[PDB]
Structures are given as C-alpha cells and as structure tokens.
C-alpha cells in the first residue's frame, strides 16, 4: 500500500511471529530513540513484548553526520540482550542497511535506510571496493 513516500530510517518486523497483532514497522525520528518498556522511567519511542526486555535495553540515535548524511548508531546496555548483524552489541556502533537487530529473545528488526540506499549509486563508481 501507501504509507509514506518519505524514507527515513525505520525498523521492520521480521520476527517469526507473522500473527503479531502489533505494528509491522516503526519509523525512527531525528534525535534519540530509547528502546525499552512502556514502564521505563521515560517514554520509550519503541516498546517490545516479553520479559527478556529491559527498561533501558538499547537506544537508536539518528543524526546527519557533519558530511550531511543521515547515520544511525545503536546504544545498547550492559544488562540487556542485544545482537547486531548476528553478533552481539554492547558498544555504540553504526547500523548498516539490512542488519539484524534483536532485542530480548525473539524480537528482530530490519533497519531500512532507503534515504541513503538511494544515493548508494551516486557514490564513487570508478574504483572498486570489497
């Protein structure tokens, strides 16, 4: 269907729960997006189910680098179960397009970065990377 022409960094629900009555995805705004529970001292932009989650599980920071590109960094905790690109994540690292971010037990999320993925082409072409 048609949700929002705009792209922006948003998380998609790819969990193994196709029956999930919750939202399918979540658009990330500009600033700090705390990922925890609906009870957390502060209002978390995104809330997860289950008990394997923590009030301050992790966070999502979205800021346009000095260069002028929108970047996202995951700020996990020391007492939370978070995994990125398959591995674990305890330090503030930048997320990639298509990386698997899990929060808790079975709470996966696909980071969609169309805003940048659109310029992927414009980027240098002559040279080759890998």
Swiss-Prot record:
It is found in: Cytoplasm, Cytoskeleton. Transmembrane segments: none annotated. Residues 33-89 form the FHA domain. The modification Phosphothreonine is found at residue 124. Isoform 3 is abundant in the skeletal muscle. It is also expressed in fetal brain, lung and kidney, and adult heart, placenta, testis, ovary and small intestine. Isoform 2 is abundant in the brain and also expressed in fetal heart, lung, liver and kidney, and adult skeletal muscle, placenta, liver, kidney, heart, spleen, thymus, prostate, testis, ovary, small intestine, colon and pancreas. It comes from the Eukaryota. Monomer. Interacts with KIFBP; positively regulates KIF1B microtubule motor activity. Interacts (via C-terminus end of the kinesin-motor domain) with CHP1; the interaction occurs in a calcium-dependent manner. It is linked to Charcot-Marie-Tooth disease, axonal, type 2A1: A dominant axonal form of Charcot-Marie-Tooth disease, a disorder of the peripheral nervous system, characterized by progressive weakness and atrophy, initially of the peroneal muscles and later of the distal muscles of the arms. Charcot-Marie-Tooth disease is classified in two main groups on the basis of electrophysiologic properties and histopathology: primary peripheral demyelinating neuropathies (designated CMT1 when they are dominantly inherited) and primary peripheral axonal neuropathies (CMT2). Neuroblastoma 1: A common neoplasm of early childhood arising from embryonic cells that form the primitive neural crest and give rise to the adrenal medulla and the sympathetic nervous system. Has a plus-end-directed microtubule motor activity and functions as a motor for transport of vesicles and organelles along microtubules. Belongs to the TRAFAC class myosin-kinesin ATPase superfamily. Kinesin family. Unc-104 subfamily. This is Kinesin-like protein KIF1B. The chain holds residues 531 to 647 of 1816 of the full protein.
């Amino acid at each position: 269907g048609s949700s929002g022409s705009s792209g922006t960094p948003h998380l998609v629900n790819l969990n193994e729960d196709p029956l999930m009555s919750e939202c399918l995805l979540y658009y990330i705004k500009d600033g700090i997006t705390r990922v925890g529970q609906a009870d957390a001292e502060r209002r978390q932009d995104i809330v997860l189910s289950g008990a394997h989650i923590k009030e301050e599980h992790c966070i999502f920071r979205s800021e346009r680098s000095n260069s002028g590109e929108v970047i996202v960094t995951l700020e996990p905790c020391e007492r939370s179960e978070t995994y990125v690109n398959g591995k674990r994540v305890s330090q503030p690292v930048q997320l990639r397009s298509g990386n698997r971010i899990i929060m808790g037990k079975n709470h996966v999320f696909r980071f969609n970065h169309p805003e940048q993925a659109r310029a992927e082409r414009e980027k240098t072409s002559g040279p080759s990377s890998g």
